[PDB]
Ligand SMILES: *[C@@H]1O[C@H](CO)[C@@H](O)[C@H](O)[C@H]1NC(C)=O
Ligand SMILES: *[C@@H]1O[C@H](CO)[C@@H](O)[C@H](O)[C@H]1NC(C)=O
């Protein structure tokens with residue numbers, strides 16, 4: 305229940321997000337080709353994909369990721385990495401909200417996520433703004449898995465509307481803000497947010513709705529199981545803020561489902 | 574390629590080997606249903622498979638695994654687990670041989686593998702013969718991945734001939750003995766050994782041939798890639814002792830290939 309072209313984009317940026325974990329380089333020199341261990345990003349390798357900027361443990365919050373240039377699919381991809389130990393990150397995850405009137409009025413965002421992007425915003429903003437210059441005809445995409453998907457969502461909403469669209473592909477991303485921030489991410493122009501979830505993944509269910517958090521619409525839900533390859537007919541678009549019938553169900557969640565988004569993600573062989 | 578039935582058996586015992594890693598209850602009571610985390614053994618869960626005897630950190634070489642009763646497929650499965658950390662086990666691997674003339678004269682086996690099996694052979698032989706006694710129409714299968722594949726190979730060659738056939742399914746198993754032991758394993762009576770390898774897996778290339786180690790015949794080589802699903806057309810039968818063309822090729826080996834035998838194995842999500 306998705307166009308074949310959309311399914312390919314979902315698959316391609318899932319591998320870009322996985323490359324933020326399994327890239328052979330975290331302190332790469334700019335210009336080297338992007339490769340993954342254990343065949344984690346086969347389609348990223350097939351393209352003329354090179355680094356533009358890499359960062360490890362930058363700002364505060366340990367923001368890790370890279371900015372890439374794809375000459376085959378005609379993209380500038382900013383990819384954030386999730387936590388190095390997702391099992392640890394889930395348990396020690398804070399729930400405090402912080403007023404983010406700098407993005408939208410009445411909006412409240414997860415304090416950890418918002419403050420992490422700001423500490424790196426001023427640096428990352430020029431790196432994307434220098435890349436969009438030398439390649440204005442290229443599509444700028446923000447992507448990330450787990451915490452990376454949350455960072456890409458905050459970064460996308462903060463840099464949108466300055467001359468270029470920014471599309472965001474998040475995989476297993478947690479809730480990032482309150483109802484007002486969820487409404488903002490749902491209708492904000494200048495790019496499309498693609499929020500991907502997998503079965504009963506626990507992370508898209510955190511922080512709880514009992515703490516004022518809310519999800520943006522729509523949701524692209526993967527019904528196929530863990531370690532099962534994903535097809536076009538295994539994805540359901542679910543419209544509605546905080547809608548049920550997808551990842552937001554009152555059943556018992558699962559951690560392994562967090563690591564299977566079109567393939568192995570969040571870890572490397 | 575292999576037949577549809579043999580392909581189904583290759584898949585089933587790969588999950589029995591993977592269950593030795595990702596069994597939820599390692600110190601499981603006898604009679605509890607066999608389940609896995611991360612969907613690591615869905616075919617075992619679908620079957621009426623229960624634990625007969627579970628052993629963890631047993632014997633000398635930290636022998637871990639379980640004996641299982643499968644009433645759906647009429648099987649008595651002895652599954653051996655590999656090393657907890659495959660990377661550290663590959664490095665700290667001795668190449669010392671020890672005479673095992675009581676299995677076959679002129680035969681020498683890897684001193685580590687043979688001594689570990691002997692440290693629990695008496696205990697495990699009784700548990701197996703007890704299960705064969707109450708289910709004489711059941712097939713006895715020894716299986717294992719990595720170090721577990723080596724233990725299943727030497728335990729089969731030892732216990733064979735005592736009234737019940739013993740088939741062995743090994744996945745990514747290293748060499749265990751000299752050429753005299755390889756020819757014995759190749760033509761031994763009372764059961765069939767299925768030695769299964771994947772692309773350029775490093776473990777079936779250890780210990781090196783230059784230290785007096787040989788591989789039994791034949792070889793079932795999975796030529797499909799890592800994180801790629803296996804079809805029956807992706808398995809190649811290769812006859813000949815120490816034959817080349819499958820896993821034994823003059824190229825650079827790979828560790829991730831060791832963790833993909835029909836699915837994720839050797840680690841758990
Ligand atoms: C980098 O990628 C390009 C495009 O595929 C390729 O032609 C080039 O050889 C790659 N560089 C290396 C060192 O592999
Ligand atoms: C255990 O498995 C058997 C056979 O598959 C089934 O009849 C039984 O209901 C199961 N019980 C539990 C608790 O899983």
Ligand SMILES: [Mg+2]
Nearest residue numbers: 479480519520
């Ligand atoms: Mg959201």
Ligand SMILES: [Mg+2]
Nearest residue numbers: 748749788789
């Ligand atoms: Mg052998």
